[PDB]
Design a protein around this ligand. Structure first.
Ligand SMILES: Nc1nc2c(ncn2[C@@H]2O[C@H](COP(=O)(O)OP(=O)(O)O)[C@@H](O)[C@H]2O)c(=O)[nH]1
Ligand code: ALF
Ligand SMILES: [Ca+2]
Ligand SMILES: [Mg+2]
Lengths: 756, 316
């Protein structure tokens, strides 16, 4: 049940709010609207200038208690306890957890903020919206130009120039060509700025020789048209994932091919003859059916009834920190940001409060970092834990606090703040005994599990240890000892370099350990500027809770945010079958394919890109793969483009990954960069789900938010793996009649000559 | 303890997965009442799939609905998305019962050969009252009859007394057979399944080629492979009960004209088919142990696999 983003009539027609601010203490009455497609939240502020917030840039919406209150006495005088706070709405947007802008509104009408807060949140977290078609993102760009209008309601030409600021001389020529106004000083009537005319403008702006090359490839030398059969055969042969079953995923019928033409083909002459022109074909390529991924991968479609140890879990390290380890702010907000982003394991370094209050507070190992009270963090966790994901959240305490009284306070705080959500005693089905497996995420939906010692860190008391059950941390002796004990509720943490040691020396024992119990991994102390280790290193040996610094968006975190988007942003990813089964065992360092595991081969050819930079600069694209050490390559790179950034085309050889031993663990990273190294955008795609054929890859920022204009056209072939020597055998299994028919003919021809 | 690896190979819908379930019933853990509830949804979906296939075949083959009021029922049922079905209530129960009762739909069922329709359709549709029941719990036969397309490669270990059999289930469709090479290491024995009933049908993946022609060609190819030099080859000629039914009105002569035996005789027909598979293979020199099976029949497979157990252990 993944419905598309729907904008209720209230949000369309609009509601009256007063937008206020704490910085400049500004107060302005505005009308909030959201466009029918749900792309932009937009309002008209001072005089008549139209402001827009991109909904995909929203990280959270808040109301009532959780809304940011006006502490300034001047603003508060214009407003006014319970009912005044009840109609507050705070919108939190930003490109990453650390860099968040807060926009505050208060409705004039009663219980309006409650609706707007909830409805914006649904639009923001909508899955189809974030994974929209290429065309839909171009329609979003169109919508922006139509909203951001001058005071007299017209679309100024300079906004169109700003949006495509690279080659502004070509932009003017395209505008002139459509009979539109093209001088910088003038503006266009919305009446006259049709979506069809916008599309016509984009076609005259960007010439597409790459799409011409593709039409000629697909049996159309008489090129301006393409028949129903040619289209259908193209979709069934080139655009289809060959790994998929013909029954589960049936091929396109001619009746369906017709419906595609009705949808995309603009020219009536081609439609009635059952054909598709370049304009229809170019539309289909960026359409809703020809996405690079299937909806199953993005949907919450994974089995969630397996034991907790059988999943990779999204994990944070010293969540509270916004920058470095030694110096910087400790934020309560970071807990909200992590949990909203799908993190299911957050770390709390609790310390002993001073004599007057004696309130436990969170901070780093008594460094030059600021402090935040524990009460506020727990309250922020409850607020956001199950907002984007219903599956359990583990609280990783690094408990100091060496006083029984403050220990009982924090245990009491957990009880009262979380309520029923806190798991305090074990479930009936899963007793804390030897041989009993860990409960499933399904069994623990909407539950807070505490992870703290019982009986460096400080010892526990009767109040704090009694909350611990399925996730008890213990000092790791060895894999021999863990196997001897046979207890799934015990777990151990590993510092990066100790985890690296066990990885290189006892990889297989580690995978066998992680079948039954949990292992958490965190970075070493040396990483004082909050650097991250490649998490893939330990996912390869089955480690579930690979913790990272969410404030730092290096490649490590980009990968983490990318892979955890899948399975409905639940925060849990199911491990490969052979890393979960007790009766199986493979070496993580295999250079050769494993029996029982279907390997894959991948072909990635980078064809072209669009609107990649806002200025004229050369661009190159990296194509990496992450997974097992054998599967990992990351030297592939296109030649830097010619200086073109509107529509650069690469005449490039394909990037082959001929043997993916364990594809269900393999993630392909496509990342675009300007000449000089500046990041443009990227995308993480699971190798097992990626489609074959020509597809647009709409790019994302470092934090995995979808960029609107930047996009790449790529050709892919993801097939099941076949070794060289054993290729003739494969062809015969796939089509045995042809082969056996030939052999039976040969024998039939020898009938007379053999005689007897 | 000794562990031996067997492959369940065959073309699509031959019965590979149904055999696995009998292994689970006989040698494995069997199906508790809890496990059986897991199939309730799958049974509902099988019924919707089957009737949708027949509703589409009324158009394809130009068969009129006998009774006028079933057109509205047909339109109700065709619009359903089978993937989101989790219950079998009205108006869909009465709609499907009314359609199944229509002489036009019955004539369309008679001509199921001319399109793709699952073989457990009659089994379920004659038993709608039992399934439609609000407190319905699938029987063990219901679970054996259910149709769930296999994809990829799944190994099932079974603990028999003297040995552990690690049996590998695979998908039978053409695209699936590209994956098969990834389960060919260290194979003790191949167990090839063949639908005896498929002699007059055509493939789902290629609606111009004979199903048995594929099964024959696949078998005669696969047994000559380097991986199986020291492997035994058991041949299960499955669905013998459906052959008994079909051979009365669908003549084997009309699809394999080299058959010179009499019409309406299952024994003669199945023995000819066995001959097509095993006889005259220039490349193959190994003995083939055939058995005529009905994979949905637990007592048949208990007897049959007891013999195959003895044969495999003997050789290894
Ligand atoms: N009547 C009958 N039906 C069978 C027999 N074997 C399998 N089936 C049914 O035919 C369908 C295909 O079986 P399945 O095991 O999924 O085929 P696979 O694709 O080869 O695994 C299922 O609905 C089974 O219940 C049989 O011996 N007799
Ligand atoms: F060969 Al199948 F379902 F068609 F296992
Ligand atoms: Ca810490
Ligand atoms: Mg099957």
């Amino acid at each position: 049940q993944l419905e598309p983003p729907t904008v209720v009539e209230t949000l369309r027609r609009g509601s009256k709010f007063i937008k206020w601010d704490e910085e400049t203490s500004s107060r302005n009455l505005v009308t909030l609207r959201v466009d029918p497609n749900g792309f932009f939240l937009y309002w008209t502020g001072p005089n008549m200038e139209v402001d827009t917030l991109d909904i995909s840039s929203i990280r959270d919406t808040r109301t009532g208690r959780y809304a940011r209150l006006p502490k300034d006495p001047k603003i508060r005088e214009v407003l006014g306890d319970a009912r005044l706070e009840e109609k507050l709405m705070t919108v939190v947007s930003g490109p990453d957890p650390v860099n968040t802008v807060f926009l505050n509104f208060m409705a004039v009408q009663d219980d309006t903020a409650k609706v707007w807060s909830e409805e914006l949140f649904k639009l923001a977290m909508n899955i189809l919206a974030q994974n929209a078609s290429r065309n839909t993102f171009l329609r979003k760009a169109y919508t922006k130009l139509k909203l951001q209008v001058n005071q007299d309601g017209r679309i100024p030409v300079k906004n169109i120039l700003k949006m495509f600021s690279a080659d502004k001389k070509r932009v003017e020529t395209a505008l002139e060509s459509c009979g539109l106004k093209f001088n910088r000083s003038e503006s266009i009537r919305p009446d006259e700025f049709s979506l069809e005319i916008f599309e016509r403008f984009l076609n005259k702006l960007c010439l597409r020789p790459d799409i011409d090359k593709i039409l000629l490839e697909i049996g159309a030398k008489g090129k301006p048209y393409l028949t129903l059969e040619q289209l259908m055969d193209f979709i069934n042969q080139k655009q289809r994932d060959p790994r998929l079953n013909e029954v589960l995923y049936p091929p396109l019928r001619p009746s369906q091919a017709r419906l595609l033409i009705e949808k995309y083909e603009p020219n009536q002459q081609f439609l009635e003859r059952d054909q598709m022109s370049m304009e229809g074909f170019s539309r289909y390529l960026g359409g809703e059916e020809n996405g690079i991924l299937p909806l199953e991968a993005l949907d919450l479609s994974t089995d969630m009834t397996q034991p907790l140890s059988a999943y990779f879990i999204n994990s944070s390290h010293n969540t509270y920190l916004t920058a470095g380890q030694l110096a910087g702010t400790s934020s309560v907000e970071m807990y909200r940001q992590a949990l909203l982003w799908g993190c299911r394991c957050v770390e709390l370094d609790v310390w002993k409060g001073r004599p007057p209050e004696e309130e436990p507070f969170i901070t780093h190992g008594f460094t030059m970092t600021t402090e935040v009270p524990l009460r506020d963090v727990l309250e922020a966790i409850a607020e956001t834990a199950f907002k984007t994901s219903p599956y359990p959240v583990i609280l990783s305490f690094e408990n100091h606090v060496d006083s029984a009284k403050q220990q009982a306070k924090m245990a009491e705080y957990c009880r009262s703040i979380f309520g029923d959500a806190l798991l305090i005693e074990p479930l009936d089905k899963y007793p804390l005994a030897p041989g009993v497996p860990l409960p499933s995420p399904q069994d623990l939906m909407g539950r807070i599990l505490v992870k703290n010692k019982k009986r460096s860190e400080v010892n526990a008391t009767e109040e704090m240890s009694t909350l611990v059950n399925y996730i008890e941390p213990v000092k790791f002796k060895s894999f021999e000892a863990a196997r001897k004990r046979n207890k799934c509720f015990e777990m151990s943490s590993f510092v990066e370099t100790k985890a690296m040691e066990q990885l290189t020396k006892s990889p297989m024992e580690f995978v066998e350990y992680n079948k039954q119990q949990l292992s958490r991994i965190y970075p070493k102390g040396t990483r004082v500027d909050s650097s991250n280790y490649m998490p893939q290193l330990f996912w390869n040996v089955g480690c579930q809770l690979v913790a990272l610094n969410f404030q730092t968006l290096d490649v490590a975190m980009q990968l983490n945010a990318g892979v955890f988007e899948y399975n409905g942003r639940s925060g849990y990813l199911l491990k490969p079958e052979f890393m979960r089964r007790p009766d199986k065992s493979f070496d993580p360092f295999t250079e050769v394919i494993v029996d029982g595991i279907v390997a894959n081969a991948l072909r990635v050819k980078v064809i072209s890109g669009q609107f990649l930079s806002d200025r004229k600069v050369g661009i190159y694209v990296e194509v990496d793969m992450f997974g097992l050490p054998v599967d990992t390559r990351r030297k592939y790179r296109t030649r830097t483009s010619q200086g073109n950034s509107f529509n650069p085309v690469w005449d490039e050889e394909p990037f082959d990954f001929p043997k993916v031993v364990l594809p269900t663990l393999a993630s392909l990273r496509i990342a675009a960069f300007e000449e000089g190294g500046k990041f443009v955008g990227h995308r993480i795609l699971p190798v097992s789900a990626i489609r074959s054929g020509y597809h647009y890859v709409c790019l994302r920022n470092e934090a995995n938010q979808p960029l609107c204009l930047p996009a790449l056209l790529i050709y892919t072939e993801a097939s099941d793996y076949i070794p060289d020597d054993h290729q003739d055998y494969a062809e015969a299994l796939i089509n045995p009649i042809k082969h056996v028919s030939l052999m039976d003919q040969r024998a039939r021809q020898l009938a007379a000559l053999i005689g007897e | 303890r000794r562990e031996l690896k067997l492959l369940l190979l065959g073309t699509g819908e031959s019965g590979k997965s149904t055999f696995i379930k009998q292994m689970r019933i006989i040698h494995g853990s069997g199906y508790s009442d809890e496990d059986k509830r897991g199939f309730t949804k799958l049974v509902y979906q099988n019924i919707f799939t089957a009737m949708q296939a027949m509703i589409r075949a009324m158009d394809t083959l130009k068969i009129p609905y006998k009774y006028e009021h079933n057109k509205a029922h047909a339109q109700l049922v065709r619009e359903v998305d089978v993937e989101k079905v989790s219950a079998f209530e009205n108006p869909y129960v009465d709609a499907i019962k009314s359609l199944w009762n229509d002489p036009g739909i019955q004539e369309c069922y008679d001509r199921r050969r001319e399109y793709q329709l699952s073989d457990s359709t009659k089994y379920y549709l004659n038993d709608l009252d039992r399934v439609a029941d609000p407190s319905y719990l699938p029987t063990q036969q219901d679970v054996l009859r259910v149709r769930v397309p296999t994809t990829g490669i799944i190994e099932y270990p079974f603990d028999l007394q003297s040995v552990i059999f690690r049996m590998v289930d695979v998908g039978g469709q053409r695209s699936e057979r590209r994956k098969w090479i990834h389960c060919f290491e260290n194979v003790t024995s191949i167990m090839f399944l063949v639908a005896l009933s498929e002699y007059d049908q055509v493939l789902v993946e290629s609606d111009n080629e004979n199903r048995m022609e594929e099964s024959k060609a696949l078998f005669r190819t696969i047994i000559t492979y380097p991986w199986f030099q020291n492997s035994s080859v058991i041949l299960f000629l499955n669905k013998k009960d459906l052959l008994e039914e079909k051979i009365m009105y669908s003549h084997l002569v009309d699809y394999f004209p080299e058959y010179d035996g009499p019409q309406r005789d299952a024994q003669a027909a199945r023995e000819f088919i066995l001959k097509m598979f095993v006889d005259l293979n220039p490349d193959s020199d190994k003995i083939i142990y055939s058995h005529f099976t009905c994979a949905t029949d637990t007592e048949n497979i208990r007897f049959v696999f007891a013999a195959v157990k003895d044969t495999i252990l003997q050789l290894n």
